[PDB]
TrEMBL record, chain A:
AB hydrolase-1 domain span: 26-143
Name of this chain's protein: AB hydrolase-1 domain-containing protein
InterPro entries recorded: AB_hydrolase, AB_hydrolase_1, AB_hydrolase_fold
Pfam families: Abhydrolase_1 (PF00561)
Length: 263, 264
């Protein structure tokens, strides 16, 4: 049964989190929008396969909004990793299979690099290493404009507009307030701090993905990096939000991939 | 432009339509599967103006090169095409060249780099087919009118610039209309399995590989992984499948810059 609630960690973040299942741990880190309701459907699916799945709204975002300003400013994968480790400690999650898209992927890599002992296997998806043109000036315009532009962009990168819309009014209202905050704290600092150096990529198993429908140039570098390093690399259906666009396929991937590493 | 436009019948029976412009080191522009060289009209002059002798041609059975034996456009592979092209180069007095090619054209480039390395300065393959998208799975099973309509829409949508595509002209599109069925029956089933992407195909001459920036990742995902694991220069170009049509200037610049690196 799904549990839903809050926990305040020692860094002051009042986290909204959810959990379902029993068995080895699976952690689902959201993308930059930090909205975990996006994992609702797949979470049940993954949990039903014998895993304890944990997800949460990111610091300062959605229901995890009661957080120190520091936790949503000058964000990097390593910064988020620290926060997540503190959360995992409080939740007594010793080791986990970890998923993450975009800033979430950066966080996955940071975890694999700096906290390898806590990671079974990492599943990064679309690690930002170079922003597209649409994000160049996003941190520079007024909040209403950021929301409007980012709501459109996200929908366009959704991989399934119907499913995107079908996330619901509550989710979309939360996203609306998240966009400006995300804009000021993420796109400028996330890409330059991508943990994609040789030294970050070999401590724990990694299975890397990019969206099947995502324009090649966007995450091209992820592919080259993975291939050059000898890391498993492939695609998932959809674009930036496979968990929303293709919940069944997404769940399958997580389950199958994590299963490879159980002992 | 001061461009030669002519015909030559090679020993294999193909009556080729070819174009040539400029003087200097040779650059060869191999069309994509559609085999219409008029798509290179603009960039040809641009490349030629940078000090290169540029040659192009309609592919066997296609457009103005349509007077060719059926076997030159059936059960097509990159290696088969390479054979024909080598024969053509011999008649045109081209000894070594920088070679460009997209899709089947790219398969051809690789075949040339693998099997005729002496004739290749550097190869510039773009989107080598290794696995067809679902839209092409049954394209050979239908009748010509159906193929022409389906492929004309398919090509336009993945043109990378529908305005430019349309701007090719009705003469070009009329030629294309007839090419579509021939391409379908002879290319998609055999081009992918014969992709010269094996280790031994890729290291005899310099290769600079590209994929369309706007092309869906999955389509040519394998090109990227292969190139990367093999230590081959890999990157993107604006557009999709026809950068020479969608983005003539950027295309021309890429060819020139890339070819220039290997000149003695
Ligand atoms: C919010 C999410 C998708 C927004 C739609 C946008 O259309 C996605 C464009 C791809 C870029 C994502 C991104 C880049 C960056 O520098 C930092 C980030 O946190 C992200 C990321 O999390 O993107
Ligand atoms: C005709 C051209 C583009 C057709 C439109 C389509 O949007 C191109 C989809 C990409 C695949 C092209 C292709 C596949 C193949 O197995 C053999 C080929 O000769 C081609 C090829 O030359 O593609």
């Amino acid at each position: 049964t799904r549990t839903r609630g809050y926990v305040t960690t020692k860094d002051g973040i009042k986290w909204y989190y959810e959990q379902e299942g029993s068995g080895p741990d699976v952690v689902l880190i959201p993308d930059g929008l930090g909205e975990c309701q996006m994992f609702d459907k797949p979470m049940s699916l993954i949990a039903s396969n014998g895993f304890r799945v944990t997800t949460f709204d990111m610091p300062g975002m959605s229901r995890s909004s009661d957080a120190p300003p520091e936790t949503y400013q000058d964000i990097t994968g390593r910064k988020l990793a620290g926060y997540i480790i503190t959360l995992l400690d409080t939740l007594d999650i010793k080791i986990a299979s970890v998923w993450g898209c975009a800033s979430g992927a950066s966080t996955v890599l940071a975890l694999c690099s700096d906290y390898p002992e806590r990671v079974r296997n990492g599943m990064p998806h679309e690690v930002p290493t170079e922003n597209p043109d649409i994000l160049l000036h996003i941190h520079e315009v007024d909040p209403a404009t950021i929301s409007q532009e980012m709501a459109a962009n996200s929908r366009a990168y959704s991989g399934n507009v119907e499913a995107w819309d079908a996330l619901g009014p509550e989710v979309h209202a939360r996203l609306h307030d998240n966009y400006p905050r995300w804009a000021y704290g993420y796109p400028r600092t996330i890409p330059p701090s991508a943990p994609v150096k040789t030294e970050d990529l070999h401590k724990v198993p990694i299975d890397w993905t990019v969206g099947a429908s995502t324009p090649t140039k966007l995450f091209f570098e992820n592919i080259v990096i993975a291939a050059r390093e000898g890391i498993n690399i492939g695609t998932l259906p959809g674009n930036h939000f496979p968990y929303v666009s293709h919940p069944e396929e997404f769940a399958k991937y997580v389950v199958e991939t994590s299963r490879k590493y159980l002992k």
